Amino acid sequence: TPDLDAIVIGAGFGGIYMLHKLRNDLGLSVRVFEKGGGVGGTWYWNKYPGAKSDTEGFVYRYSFDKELLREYDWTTRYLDQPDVLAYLEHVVERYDLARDIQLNTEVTDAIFDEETELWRVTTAGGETLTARFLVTALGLLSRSNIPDIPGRDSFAGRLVHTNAWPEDLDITGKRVGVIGTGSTGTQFIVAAAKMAEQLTVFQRTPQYCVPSGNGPMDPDEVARIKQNFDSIWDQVRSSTVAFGFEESTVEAMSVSESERQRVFQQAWDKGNGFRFMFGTFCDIATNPEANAAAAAFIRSKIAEIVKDPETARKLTPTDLYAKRPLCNEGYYETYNRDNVSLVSLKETPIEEIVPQGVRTSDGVVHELDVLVFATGFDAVDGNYRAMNLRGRDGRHINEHWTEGPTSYLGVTKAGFPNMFMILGPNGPFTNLPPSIEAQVEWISDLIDKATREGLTTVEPTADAEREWTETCAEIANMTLFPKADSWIFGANIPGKRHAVMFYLGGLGNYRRQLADVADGGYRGFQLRG
């Protein structure tokens, strides 16, 4: 007899909803463990200036409760971190969740016992306890990547990763350096340049960026959106990226050059990087010729905006427009400020971090008070591999993942009975809340089935999981995403395996996959009782 029906790890969007479903809707005994000192996940940790979601606010939220959709107000097109955090706090209040969320608690081990058919969880604080079902909502973008740059530990000032940004830290009037120019570093840059006495940007690889179009909302527009939520969410759930805009069905090279220009400009004007990539034409991320047009458009904007021609050159990407799409308020314009300098690490790599700052290969010591690592994440599988997570035959998850991380349907793992993952390997790449909902609800139904039928284990087969990997690989290979150097395929971490880590078929497709497996008697699962 287990201590609990279920244990959930993580208190972001994922664990919050999971706990609600299992405890409030199914009546099970449940506890969440979260390592942070507060709920919110990404939106607890990422306290840096500029931190925000690029999903527009109207759809960066749960959809499952109509009353909450009616009552909760937003006032800006995009939601800054504090605002997302406040929403998730409200959710925890609303559904009386906080009493079952144990904070400051890192789970260091999770071990299946094949004899008792129970999971045993161990905390960093030295406690253990058992559950029949384990749900890991550990975050695709949660384990910080802090590179081993020589002399890093010598720096005498405040050295922080963005995913560990300290609430107390005020960079106003300080000399700040930032390493990294992905989505995090670019939004930080915009914000920080307005506060810092000097900002130095240490850029290894320039990225493409479009306007966000952020600003206040018209409150009458928010009321209209609320009145139309049913339609809005139907379109989200059937779409590929789930960002709340209608995706193009037009091939880029099927129209005239003037019409391409017009379409790109319209999207540029409206804002949002996912809109640029998927709201313009249907084939920007699959057809090299279409990709080249989109990339050219953005390069032309850089050249218009950035006054200094060497700065413009250093900011102009040369690679495929196939990284996670960026958007920002006035990113390239920030380089026109007198208090911002751009160091290309291709020209002058970092030689050593020193007590006073960063020394680049030209011998220049960049003197800093604050050094910010916007260096991204050990994405998707990082928190799984770092756990002592063991399944049948006492095998660690790493033994299953030697050619990259794997799952069946994003949510389960062969050899790991009664373990469910929220946003595990080889799941959807979308606006994440509605993907999380699809997964949570599917997991809930399957756990309920086990409860009603008296099942003791639920597990995918090895064959099912291998087929899923092949599905994901084949879809990925139909796109340009494998051909961009970034975290999506593992390439960002030295030594990490380059592998597919997402199902790239989209939300509507993904939802059908889940529904078809369930409706087909849980095709691919051993159900034992």
Ligand SMILES: Cc1cc2nc3c(=O)[nH]c(=O)nc-3n(C[C@H](O)[C@H](O)[C@H](O)COP(=O)(O)OP(=O)(O)OC[C@H]3O[C@@H](n4cnc5c(N)ncnc54)[C@H](O)[C@@H]3O)c2cc1C
């Ligand atoms: C700065 C930033 C901007 C983002 N912008 C967007 C956006 O525009 N659109 C979009 O859809 N998504 C965006 N995301 C992705 C975002 O992570 C997800 O939308 C969503 O917040 C994920 O929720 P989650 O619950 O799956 O994971 P997370 O919010 O990552 O939560 C996982 C939690 O698990 C905890 N945890 C992990 N391992 C352990 C353990 N071993 N023991 C205990 N606790 C543990 C972590 O501390 C964390 O709180 C962004 C991410 C970042 C970092």
Ligand SMILES: NC(=O)c1ccc[n+]([C@@H]2O[C@H](COP(=O)([O-])OP(=O)(O)OC[C@H]3O[C@@H](n4cnc5c(N)ncnc54)[C@H](OP(=O)(O)O)[C@@H]3O)[C@@H](O)[C@H]2O)c1
């Ligand atoms: N606006 C939002 O919606 C938003 C905001 C933040 C995060 N996110 C999400 O989180 C994901 C990750 O974004 P991120 O910006 O945190 O990480 P990222 O995309 O992985 O970017 C990391 C940055 O650090 C650089 N870097 C890494 N290691 C380095 C090293 N050893 N030396 C120098 N530079 C190094 C990378 O350069 P290279 O390119 O040369 O490797 C890159 O510029 C996004 O793609 C998005 O999915 C979203």
Ligand SMILES: NC(=O)c1cccnc1
């Ligand atoms: N928008 C993002 O940040 C995101 C991250 C991971 C997967 N899908 C979307």
